[PDB]
Design a protein around this ligand. Structure first.
Ligand SMILES: *[C@@H]1O[C@H](CO)[C@@H](O[C@@H]2O[C@H](CO)[C@@H](O)[C@H](O)[C@H]2NC(C)=O)[C@H](O)[C@H]1NC(C)=O
Ligand SMILES: *[C@@H]1O[C@H](CO)[C@@H](O[C@@H]2O[C@H](CO)[C@@H](O)[C@H](O)[C@H]2NC(C)=O)[C@H](O)[C@H]1NC(C)=O
Ligand SMILES: *[C@@H]1O[C@H](CO)[C@@H](O[C@@H]2O[C@H](CO)[C@@H](O)[C@H](O)[C@H]2NC(C)=O)[C@H](O)[C@H]1NC(C)=O
Ligand SMILES: N[C@@H](Cc1c[nH]c2ccccc12)C(=O)O
Ligand SMILES: N[C@@H](Cc1c[nH]c2ccccc12)C(=O)O
Ligand SMILES: *[C@@H]1O[C@H](CO)[C@@H](O)[C@H](O)[C@H]1NC(C)=O
Ligand SMILES: *[C@@H]1O[C@H](CO)[C@@H](O)[C@H](O)[C@H]1NC(C)=O
Ligand SMILES: [Ca+2]
Ligand SMILES: [Ca+2]
Ligand SMILES: [Ca+2]
Lengths: 547, 94, 99, 49
C-alpha cells in the first residue's frame, strides 16, 4: 500500500521520511477526455539523495550502538515527494492508514504504525503534510522548512523543526542594506508560503529604517512567457542596482535564464539561503549576470564517517534502497539490464562529478542527522524513566513495548540533550531552534573555472540589536572583479550651499537641489531648509556660512 | 478534514489497495466550505481524486491557481475587485 | 415569537449562492443525461453513462457549463473557475422606532 | 511653498513663504516661480506686477 519505489526496512519502531529526489513533475495539461493517471517526475536531484542517505546512516548508527536504545531495532519508510503537494499527501495517507481506519471505523487488521516522520523541504508541502499529521497527533520534525506561519501552535499541533525561521534573515538583510548605505532597492519573491511572509517582514523592517522600495514582483516555477517578460521589463526600467530575492532555485531559474539571454549586467543580488548555494543558479555561463552575489549560509556540522558510507552505494547491494537504481543510471548514463549502453556494474562513483560527493560543508544533512537523534533520544528518555518520575498524570511511565505517538510528542516537547559537537539541543515552546548565520560571496576559481563561495562575515543572533552583523569588506569582489562599493541612491546629495526639493508623485528618497536665498545659509550635506543668518550678520556669496 | 476523509473513503481504499464494509457510498461533488483557509485544506485532499468542489463564500485569489487546485469552482467573485473598489472609494472622497 | 437571524433578514445573498451551487451540479448532470452519440466531450465523441457516472466526468461537464438561472440571467464559469458580480455599498444607520 | 519634513512620508509637509522676487499662484505648490524680466512681485507673493 502506497507508492512503488521506496526505501524500507523492518524493525520494532518505524520512522517515516519525505525527501525531494526529483525537482518537479511533468508540465502536462489536464484535459478530461479520458481518466487521469499518475504524473511523472522529470528532473533528478543528486543533493536530495545525499539527504536521504543521512537518515539511513543515522538509523544504522543508532542500531549498532549498545549505549543508545539497547535491544531495540529501528526501521524506516521513505518516499519521494518531487516537491509537490499531491505526492506528499499520498505518502501521508500511506502513513496514517491505521489511525484513520479506527477514526472512520472503516481488510488488513495488521499494519505497521508510524510514531514520527522526518519532515519535508518546502514550506507549503510541510503545511499540507502537517494539516493531516496533526489530526492523529503524530510528531513531525522538519529539517528545511523555515516559514514563520508554521510557528502557530493553534493550527499545527505537532510540528517541530531543526532550522530557525525567517525573521532573522529579513532583519539581517535590512541591517546589511543599512550598513552599506543604500536607500533605493527592489524586491522579488516566490509566490508560496516561503517567500511572501519573508518579503513582508523585510518590507516592514526597511521602512522603519528609512529605505525606499521601488518595485515588488512575484515569480513562480510555472510562470509563462508573458509574466517573465513583464518582470524583466520592470527590472530594466528602474535605476535601483540592489535587488533582494526571497526564493529557491526551481522558482528562480526561468527569470535568471531570461535575464542572462538579454545580457543585463551591473545588478547587485542579495540571496536568501534557499538559493544562495544552489547549483541551478551558480553556473559558469551565468557569471556575467549573477557574479558577485552576497547570500546567507547555515552553520556546518561534522559527521565523522559519512563520506565512506556514501562511497559504498551500489545498485546490486542496496536491497533496502529503491532509489539507488535510478541514481546509478542517472550518474553513469547507462541502462541496467532487467539506446543507452548496458551498465557493467564495476564503475567507480568518484570519476563523475555530481553534487553527491562534491561538497565542502554539511548543513542540511546535519539537520537530518539531528532530526533523527532527537527522536532517538526522546525514545531513550521514555525507556529510562522510573515510576513516580514520569511526565504523565500521576508520574506514570509509558510502556516502551506499547509506545504511542502522542507520548513521543510529549517527550519531544521536553527534550534536552547534547550532540556530537558538544552543544545542547532544546526546542522552545514553538518547536524552533536558534542558530547562527554565515555570509558568503560568489567568486571565480582561477584554475578550475567554477564558482567558489567565499565567507566574508557572519550574523550573531545571541547578541543585542545593532551589534549582530560583521562584514570584512576587503574580501569582497563586487562583481567578481571590482573593489569599490557601488552607488545605489535615488539622487545625489545636495551640497552645503543648497537645500532639498520636492518632486511631485515621488517618494522622499528622490529630491532636487535648490540654492539658498540671499541672507540665509546652510552647513549640512543634506539640508531640508536653508537656515537664516543671525542678526547684524549677512551670508557669504556662496551661502556656505555667515559673515 | 475529518469530515472530508469520509467523503473519499472508497477512492482512497481503491488507491491504496489495502481493501471490508462492502457498502460505501461515493460522493460525486461537494458544496465547498465558507472560509478560505478551510477551503484550501479541503481542496488539497479532494483534488487527489478529481472530485469537483463548488464553494459559495470563499473568495481568496490564491484559489484561482489551477496547477494546485484542479477541481475548485466558485459562485462568488474574488477580492481583487473589492480592493480596487476600496481604493476608488478612498480616492473619491479625497 | 423569538427573534433570531434564522428568519430575521431582508435579502438572500449568501444563501442564494448555495441554491445556485446546487443547480450548477444538477444542470451538469442533466447535460450528461441528454448526450446524443457522436456529440460527447470525451474521446471520439463518446458520452458517459448516467447509471455509472464518475466524478471526473462531472468535473469535465462542469468546466463547460452554460445555463440560465431562475432570474433569467446566464451562469457560466471562466477558465479559472470564478465568476463576476456587481457590488453594493451600504451605510450603518440607527432605527428610531426600535434602536 | 511646500517644505520637507525629515523622516516622514510625502503626504505630510510644511509651508514656507516665497522670497521677495518670486511668486506662487496655486494651492499645494512645491516651488516658487520667478517673475518675468521686467516684472516684480507685490506684497503678497501671489502675482507679478
Ligand atoms: C545615500 O543615502 C544614504 C541615506 O541617507 C546616505 O547615508 C547617510 O549619509 C549621511 C551623511 O553622512 C549620514 O549622516 C547618515 O547617517 C547616513 N544614513 C545611513 C542610514 O547610513 C548616503 O550618504 C548616501 N550616499 C550617497 C553616495 O549619496
Ligand atoms: C555565533 O557566532 C558568535 C560569533 O562568531 C559566537 O561567539 C563566539 O564564540 C566563540 C566560542 O567561545 C568565542 O571564542 C568568540 O569570542 C565568540 N565571539 C563573540 C563575538 O562573542 C557564538 O558562540 C556563535 N553561537 C553558536 C551557538 O555557535
Ligand atoms: C485632502 O488631500 C487631498 C490631496 O490628496 C486634497 O485634494 C486635492 O485638492 C485640490 C484642490 O481642490 C485638487 O485640485 C486636487 O485634485 C485634489 N486631489 C485629489 C486627490 O483629487 C484635499 O483638498 C484635502 N482636503 C482638505 C480638506 O484639505
Ligand atoms: N527553506 C526552504 C527550503 C530549502 C532550504 N534549502 C533549500 C535548498 C534547495 C531547495 C529548497 C531548500 C523553504 O522553506 O522552502
Ligand atoms: N468569504 C469569506 C468568509 C465569509 C464570508 N461571509 C461570511 C460570514 C460569516 C463568516 C465568514 C464569512 C472568506 O473568503 O473567507
Ligand atoms: C538543558 O540541560 C543543560 C544542562 O544539562 C542546562 O544547562 C540547560 O539550561 C537545559 N535547558 C533548559 C532549556 O533548561
Ligand atoms: C451561453 O449561452 C448563451 C445563450 O444560449 C449564448 O448567448 C452564449 O454565447 C453562451 N456562451 C457564453 C460563454 O455565454
Ligand atoms: Ca541500539
Ligand atoms: Ca507613485
Ligand atoms: Ca520614518
Amino acid at each position: 500500500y502506497g507508492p512503488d519505489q521506496r526505501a524500507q526496512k523492518k524493525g520494532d519502531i518505524i520512522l517515516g521520511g519525505l525527501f525531494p529526489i526529483h525537482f518537479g513533475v511533468a508540465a502536462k495539461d489536464q484535459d478530461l477526455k479520458s481518466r487521469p493517471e499518475s504524473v511523472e517526475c522529470i528532473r533528478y536531484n543528486f543533493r536530495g539523495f545525499r539527504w536521504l542517505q543521512a537518515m539511513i546512516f543515522a538509523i544504522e548508527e543508532i542500531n549498532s550502538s549498545p549505549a543508545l536504545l539497547p535491544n531495540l531495532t529501528l526501521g524506516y519508510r521513505i518516499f519521494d515527494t518531487c516537491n509537490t503537494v499531491s505526492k506528499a499527501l499520498e505518502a501521508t495517507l500511506s502513513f496514517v492508514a491505521q489511525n484513520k481506519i479506527d477514526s472512520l471505523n472503516l481488510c488488513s487488521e495488521h499494519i505497521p504504525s508510524t510514531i514520527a516522520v522526518v519532515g519535508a523541504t518546502g514550506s507549503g508541502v510541510s503545511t499540507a503534510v502537517a494539516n493531516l499529521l496533526g489530526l492523529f497527533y503524530i510528531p513531525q520534525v522538519s529539517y528545511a522548512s523555515s516559514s514563520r506561519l508554521l510557528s502557530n501552535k493553534n493550527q499545527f499541533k505537532s510540528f517541530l523543526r531543526t532550522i530557525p525561521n525567517d525573521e532573522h534573515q529579513a532583519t539581517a538583510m535590512a541591517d546589511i542594506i543599512e550598513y552599506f548605505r543604500w536607500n533605493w532597492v527592489g524586491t522579488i519573491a516566490a509566490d508560496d508560503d516561503y517567500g511572501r511572509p519573508g518579503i513582508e517582514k523585510f518590507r516592514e523592517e526597511a521602512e522603519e529604517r528609512d529605505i525606499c522600495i521601488d518595485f515588488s514582483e512575484l515569480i513562480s516555477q510555472y510562470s509563462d512567457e508573458e509574466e517573465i517578460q513583464h518582470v524583466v521589463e520592470v527590472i530594466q526600467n528602474s535605476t535601483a542596482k540592489v535587488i533582494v530575492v526571497f526564493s529557491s532555485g526551481p522558482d528562480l531559474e526561468p527569470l535568471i535564464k531570461e535575464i542572462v539571454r538579454r545580457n543585463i549586467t551591473g545588478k547587485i543580488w542579495l540571496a536568501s539561503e534557499a538559493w544562495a548555494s544552489s547549483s541551478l543558479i551558480a553556473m559558469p555561463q551565468y557569471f556575467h549576470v549573477v557574479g558577485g552575489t552576497i547570500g546567507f549560509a547555515l552553520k556546518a556540522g561534522q559527521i565523522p564517517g559519512f563520506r565512506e558510507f556514501l562511497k559504498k552505494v551500489h545498485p546490486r547491494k542496496s536491497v533496502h534502497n529503491g532509489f539507488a537504481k535510478e541514481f546509478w543510471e542517472e550518474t553513469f548514463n547507462c541502462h541496467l539490464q532487467e539506446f543507452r549502453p548496458l551498465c557493467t556494474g564495476d564503475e567507480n562513483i568518484s570519476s563523475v562529478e555530481t553534487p553527491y560527493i562534491d561538497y565542502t560543508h554539511l548543513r542540511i544533512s546535519y539537520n537530518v542527522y539531528l532530526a533523527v537523534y532527537s527522536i532517538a533520544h526522546a525514545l531513550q528518555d521514555i525507556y529510562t524513566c522510573l515510576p513516580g518520575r514520569g511526565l504523565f498524570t500521576n508520574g506514570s511511565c509509558a510502556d516502551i513495548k506499547k509506545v504511542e505517538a502522542w507520548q513521543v510528542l510529549k517527550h519531544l516537547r521536553h527534550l534536552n540533550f547534547t550532540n556530537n559537537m558538544g552543544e545542547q539541543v532544546t526546542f522552545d515552546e514553538c518547536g524552533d531552534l536558534v542558530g547562527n548565520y554565515s555570509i558568503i560571496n560568489w567568486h571565480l576559481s582561477p584554475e578550475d573555472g567554477s564558482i567558489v563561495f567565499k565567507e566574508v562575515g557572519y550574523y550573531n543572533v545571541y547578541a543585542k540589536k545593532g551589534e549582530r552583523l560583521f562584514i570584512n569588506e576587503e574580501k569582497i569582489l563586487w562583481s567578481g572583479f571590482s573593489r569599490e562599493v557601488p552607488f545605489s541612491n535615488c539622487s545625489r546629495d545636495c551640497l552645503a550651499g543648497t537645500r532639498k526639493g520636492i518632486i511631485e508623485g515621488e517618494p522622499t528618497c528622490c529630491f532636487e537641489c535648490v540654492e539658498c536665498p540671499d541672507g540665509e545659509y546652510s552647513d549640512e550635506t543634506d539640508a531640508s531648509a536653508c537656515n537664516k543668518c543671525p542678526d547684524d550678520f549677512w551670508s557669504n556669496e556662496n551661502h556656505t556660512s555667515c559673515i | 478534514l475529518e469530515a472530508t476523509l469520509s467523503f473519499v473513503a472508497q477512492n482512497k481504499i481503491d488507491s491504496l489497495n489495502l481493501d471490508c464494509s462492502e457498502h460505501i457510498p461515493s460522493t460525486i461533488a461537494v458544496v465547498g466550505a465558507t472560509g478560505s483557509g478551510v477551503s484550501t485544506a479541503v481542496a488539497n485532499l479532494l483534488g487527489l481524486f478529481y472530485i469537483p468542489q463548488v464553494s459559495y463564500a470563499s473568495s481568496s485569489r490564491l484559489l484561482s491557481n489551477k496547477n494546485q487546485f484542479k477541481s475548485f469552482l466558485r459562485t462568488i467573485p474574488n477580492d481583487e475587485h473589492q480592493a480596487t473598489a476600496m481604493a476608488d472609494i478612498i480616492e473619491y472622497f479625497r
